[PDB]
Short mmCIF file of all heavy atoms in Angstrom, two decimals:
data_model
loop_
_atom_site.label_atom_id
_atom_site.label_comp_id
_atom_site.label_asym_id
_atom_site.label_seq_id
_atom_site.Cartn_x
_atom_site.Cartn_y
_atom_site.Cartn_z
N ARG A 36 124.29 79.30 123.10
CA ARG A 36 123.34 80.27 122.61
C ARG A 36 122.04 80.35 123.40
O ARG A 36 121.27 81.28 123.19
CB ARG A 36 123.03 80.01 121.12
CG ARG A 36 122.20 78.81 120.82
CD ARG A 36 121.59 78.93 119.43
NE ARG A 36 122.21 78.06 118.45
CZ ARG A 36 121.86 76.80 118.24
NH1 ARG A 36 120.88 76.23 118.92
NH2 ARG A 36 122.51 76.08 117.34
N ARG A 71 135.70 67.24 125.81
CA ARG A 71 136.08 67.91 124.57
C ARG A 71 137.05 69.04 124.89
O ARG A 71 136.70 69.99 125.59
CB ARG A 71 134.85 68.47 123.86
CG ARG A 71 133.79 67.45 123.56
CD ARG A 71 134.06 66.78 122.24
NE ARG A 71 132.98 65.89 121.85
CZ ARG A 71 133.15 64.78 121.14
NH1 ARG A 71 134.35 64.40 120.75
NH2 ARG A 71 132.09 64.06 120.81
N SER A 94 129.04 84.95 132.68
CA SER A 94 129.29 86.20 133.38
C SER A 94 130.41 87.00 132.73
O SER A 94 131.33 86.44 132.13
CB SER A 94 129.63 85.91 134.84
OG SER A 94 129.75 87.11 135.57
N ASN A 214 173.97 102.54 87.54
CA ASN A 214 175.33 102.79 87.98
C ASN A 214 175.39 103.39 89.37
O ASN A 214 176.48 103.55 89.91
CB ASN A 214 176.05 103.68 86.96
CG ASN A 214 176.58 102.88 85.79
OD1 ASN A 214 176.80 101.69 85.89
ND2 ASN A 214 176.76 103.54 84.66
N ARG A 240 148.31 106.01 99.50
CA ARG A 240 147.59 107.28 99.51
C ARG A 240 148.53 108.45 99.75
O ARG A 240 148.28 109.56 99.27
CB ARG A 240 146.49 107.25 100.58
CG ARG A 240 145.25 106.50 100.19
CD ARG A 240 144.45 106.11 101.41
NE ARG A 240 145.02 104.94 102.06
CZ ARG A 240 144.50 103.72 101.98
NH1 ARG A 240 143.36 103.49 101.36
NH2 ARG A 240 145.15 102.71 102.55
N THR A 242 152.92 109.38 101.31
CA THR A 242 154.26 108.88 101.54
C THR A 242 155.00 109.93 102.36
O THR A 242 154.51 111.04 102.54
CB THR A 242 154.96 108.55 100.20
OG1 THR A 242 156.10 107.72 100.43
CG2 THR A 242 155.39 109.78 99.48
P C C 642 144.19 99.74 102.02
OP1 C C 642 143.06 100.19 101.19
OP2 C C 642 144.71 100.60 103.09
"O5'" C C 642 143.75 98.37 102.67
"C5'" C C 642 143.36 97.29 101.86
"C4'" C C 642 143.54 95.98 102.56
"O4'" C C 642 144.94 95.74 102.84
"C3'" C C 642 142.88 95.86 103.92
"O3'" C C 642 141.49 95.60 103.82
"C2'" C C 642 143.67 94.73 104.56
"O2'" C C 642 143.23 93.48 104.07
"C1'" C C 642 145.07 95.00 104.02
N1 C C 642 145.91 95.75 104.98
C2 C C 642 146.52 95.03 105.99
O2 C C 642 146.31 93.82 106.00
N3 C C 642 147.29 95.65 106.89
C4 C C 642 147.45 96.96 106.82
N4 C C 642 148.21 97.53 107.74
C5 C C 642 146.84 97.72 105.80
C6 C C 642 146.09 97.10 104.90
P A C 730 159.37 107.18 101.49
OP1 A C 730 158.00 107.51 101.89
OP2 A C 730 159.67 105.81 101.05
"O5'" A C 730 159.85 108.17 100.34
"C5'" A C 730 158.93 108.81 99.49
"C4'" A C 730 158.80 108.09 98.17
"O4'" A C 730 157.54 108.45 97.58
"C3'" A C 730 159.84 108.43 97.12
"O3'" A C 730 161.00 107.62 97.22
"C2'" A C 730 159.10 108.25 95.81
"O2'" A C 730 159.09 106.88 95.44
"C1'" A C 730 157.67 108.62 96.20
N9 A C 730 157.30 110.01 95.87
C8 A C 730 156.95 111.00 96.74
N7 A C 730 156.62 112.12 96.16
C5 A C 730 156.74 111.83 94.82
C6 A C 730 156.53 112.61 93.67
N6 A C 730 156.14 113.87 93.70
N1 A C 730 156.75 112.03 92.48
C2 A C 730 157.14 110.76 92.46
N3 A C 730 157.37 109.93 93.46
C4 A C 730 157.15 110.54 94.62
P G C 969 131.54 67.37 113.32
OP1 G C 969 132.36 66.79 114.41
OP2 G C 969 132.22 67.88 112.11
"O5'" G C 969 130.47 66.29 112.84
"C5'" G C 969 130.78 65.33 111.85
"C4'" G C 969 129.91 64.10 111.98
"O4'" G C 969 130.27 63.40 113.20
"C3'" G C 969 128.42 64.38 112.07
"O3'" G C 969 127.69 63.33 111.45
"C2'" G C 969 128.16 64.38 113.58
"O2'" G C 969 126.83 64.05 113.93
"C1'" G C 969 129.15 63.32 114.06
N9 G C 969 129.62 63.54 115.43
C8 G C 969 130.70 64.29 115.81
N7 G C 969 130.90 64.30 117.10
C5 G C 969 129.88 63.50 117.60
C6 G C 969 129.57 63.13 118.93
O6 G C 969 130.14 63.44 119.98
N1 G C 969 128.46 62.30 118.99
C2 G C 969 127.73 61.88 117.90
N2 G C 969 126.69 61.07 118.17
N3 G C 969 128.01 62.21 116.66
C4 G C 969 129.09 63.01 116.58
P C C 973 117.18 75.64 118.94
OP1 C C 973 118.63 75.78 119.04
OP2 C C 973 116.31 75.88 120.11
"O5'" C C 973 116.65 76.58 117.77
"C5'" C C 973 117.42 76.82 116.61
"C4'" C C 973 116.56 76.90 115.37
"O4'" C C 973 116.26 75.57 114.89
"C3'" C C 973 115.19 77.55 115.55
"O3'" C C 973 115.24 78.96 115.50
"C2'" C C 973 114.38 76.95 114.42
"O2'" C C 973 114.67 77.61 113.20
"C1'" C C 973 114.95 75.54 114.35
N1 C C 973 114.15 74.55 115.11
C2 C C 973 112.92 74.15 114.60
O2 C C 973 112.51 74.65 113.55
N3 C C 973 112.20 73.23 115.26
C4 C C 973 112.67 72.70 116.38
N4 C C 973 111.92 71.80 117.00
C5 C C 973 113.93 73.07 116.93
C6 C C 973 114.63 73.99 116.26
P A C 1416 177.74 101.38 80.79
OP1 A C 1416 178.65 100.60 79.94
OP2 A C 1416 177.91 101.37 82.25
"O5'" A C 1416 177.82 102.89 80.32
"C5'" A C 1416 177.66 103.24 78.95
"C4'" A C 1416 177.89 104.71 78.74
"O4'" A C 1416 176.87 105.47 79.45
"C3'" A C 1416 179.20 105.24 79.29
"O3'" A C 1416 180.27 105.05 78.39
"C2'" A C 1416 178.88 106.70 79.56
"O2'" A C 1416 178.91 107.45 78.36
"C1'" A C 1416 177.44 106.62 80.02
N9 A C 1416 177.31 106.51 81.49
C8 A C 1416 177.00 105.39 82.20
N7 A C 1416 176.93 105.57 83.48
C5 A C 1416 177.21 106.92 83.63
C6 A C 1416 177.27 107.75 84.76
N6 A C 1416 177.08 107.33 85.99
N1 A C 1416 177.58 109.03 84.57
C2 A C 1416 177.78 109.46 83.33
N3 A C 1416 177.74 108.79 82.19
C4 A C 1416 177.44 107.51 82.41
#
Side-chain angles (χ1 to χ4, degrees):
Chain A
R36 72 161 106 87
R71 304 273 186 212
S94 186
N214 278 336
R240 282 160 281 256
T242 196

